[PDB]
Enzyme design. Structure first.
Site, PDB file in Angstrom:
ATOM      1  CG  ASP A 189      -2.148  -0.941   1.311  1.00 29.32           C
ATOM      2  OD1 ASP A 189      -2.172  -1.514   0.390  1.00 29.32           O
ATOM      3  OD2 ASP A 189      -3.042  -0.566   2.185  1.00 29.32           O
ATOM      4  CG  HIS A 232       1.964  -0.227   4.582  1.00 26.37           C
ATOM      5  ND1 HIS A 232       1.611  -1.388   5.489  1.00 26.37           N
ATOM      6  CD2 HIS A 232       0.739   0.440   4.641  1.00 26.37           C
ATOM      7  CE1 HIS A 232       0.488  -1.354   6.076  1.00 26.37           C
ATOM      8  NE2 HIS A 232      -0.269  -0.505   5.482  1.00 26.37           N
TER       9      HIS A 232
HETATM   10  O1  LIG Z   1      -4.280   2.239   4.890  1.00 29.44           O
HETATM   11  C1  LIG Z   1      -3.812   1.478   5.273  1.00 29.44           C
HETATM   12  N1  LIG Z   1      -2.916   0.626   4.804  1.00 29.44           N
HETATM   13  O2  LIG Z   1      -2.269   1.040   3.406  1.00 29.44           O
HETATM   14  C2  LIG Z   1      -4.099   1.079   6.895  1.00 29.44           C
HETATM   15  C3  LIG Z   1      -4.826   0.002   6.990  1.00 29.44           C
HETATM   16  C4  LIG Z   1      -5.010  -0.649   8.110  1.00 29.44           C
HETATM   17  C5  LIG Z   1      -5.128   0.080   9.064  1.00 29.44           C
HETATM   18  C6  LIG Z   1      -4.162   1.452   9.277  1.00 29.44           C
HETATM   19  C7  LIG Z   1      -4.018   2.118  10.522  1.00 29.44           C
HETATM   20  C8  LIG Z   1      -3.578   3.149  10.262  1.00 29.44           C
HETATM   21  C9  LIG Z   1      -3.232   3.841   9.221  1.00 29.44           C
HETATM   22  C10 LIG Z   1      -3.395   3.042   7.992  1.00 29.44           C
HETATM   23  C11 LIG Z   1      -3.754   1.843   8.070  1.00 29.44           C
HETATM   24 ZN   LIG Z   2      -2.848   3.176   3.292  1.00 31.86          ZN
END
Ligand SMILES: O=C(NO)c1cccc2ccccc12
Ligand SMILES: [Zn+2]
Length: 225
Positions: free
Chosen positions: A18, A167
């Site tokens: 991501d 990520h």
């Molecule tokens: O957007 C996200 N991953 O790409 C994301 C997925 C799941 C939990 C999270 C918590 C804080 C910030 C981002 C996330």
């Molecule tokens: Zn994200």
């Protein structure tokens, strides 16, 4: 619009990434490509860099059979937006992929994994074929953050048909975790596939997108200003 969080193809395993592309993406794709491993990439438009500054990475990614899908333009909390703002947040990413690649994405993953009926309606209205969640988290964005060694060890016990969250904005995911876990997963019999392929949707990359026009040439509209 269906919501997916687990592969269906026996022996498949989806490494997903991501928030990219980012400054380590050429390294990450080189590592994947050298192992004939396919990643799934849920990209942003304006978040950790402007998608147009990453056009060359995106084109390499697109032409190498990696799966590219939307993570929204600005990485918004989609349960907080109106129908219109969400349409706009998706549209902007579609526009960038049309300019750079010639195509529209057919899939998306919501920021924060947050979605509701309005998101699903917008996706339906915009022609999307799926909303892609996940079923194992690398932990590479937990805080405090596990070590690379801990994350790699977690991967040793993720089962077949996992859709794993990572990520690409984390240097250690690119430089330590993924080079370690590709051999772990391949050597124990798993096939490192894109999400659509491991879901038994098509393994043809052209089926993951809608062709719109020929790819554009960079001009002054290739901007996030
Ligand atoms: O957007 C996200 N991953 O790409 C994301 C997925 C799941 C939990 C999270 C918590 C804080 C910030 C981002 C996330
Ligand atoms: Zn994200």
């Amino acid at each position: 619009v269906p919501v997916y969080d687990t592969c269906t193809v026996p022996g498949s395993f989806a490494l997903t990434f991501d928030d990219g592309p980012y400054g380590f993406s050429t390294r990450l794709d080189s590592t994947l490509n050298a192992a004939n491993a396919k990643g799934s990439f849920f990209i942003n438009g304006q978040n950790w860099g402007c998608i147009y500054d990453y056009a060359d990475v995106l084109l390499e990614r697109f032409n190498n059979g990696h799966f590219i899908a939307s993570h929204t333009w600005s990485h918004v909390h989609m349960n907080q937006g109106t129908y219109e703002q969400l349409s706009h947040q998706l549209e902007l990413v579609e526009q960038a992929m049309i300019r750079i690649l010639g195509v529209k994405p057919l899939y998306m993953r919501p920021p924060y994994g947050e979605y509701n009926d309005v998101v699903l309606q917008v996706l339906r209205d915009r022609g999307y074929k799926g909303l892609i969640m996940w079923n194992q988290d690398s932990g590479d964005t937990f805080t405090p953050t596990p070590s690379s060694a801990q994350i790699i060890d977690s991967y040793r016990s993720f089962p077949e048909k996992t859709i794993s969250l990572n990520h690409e904005i984390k240097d250690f995911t690119v430089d330590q975790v993924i080079p370690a876990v590709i051999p772990i997963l391949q050597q124990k019999g798993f096939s490192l596939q894109t999400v659509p392929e491991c879901l038994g949707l098509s393994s043809d990359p052209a089926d993951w997108y809608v062709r719109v026009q020929e790819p554009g040439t960079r001009d002054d509209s290739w901007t996030c200003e």
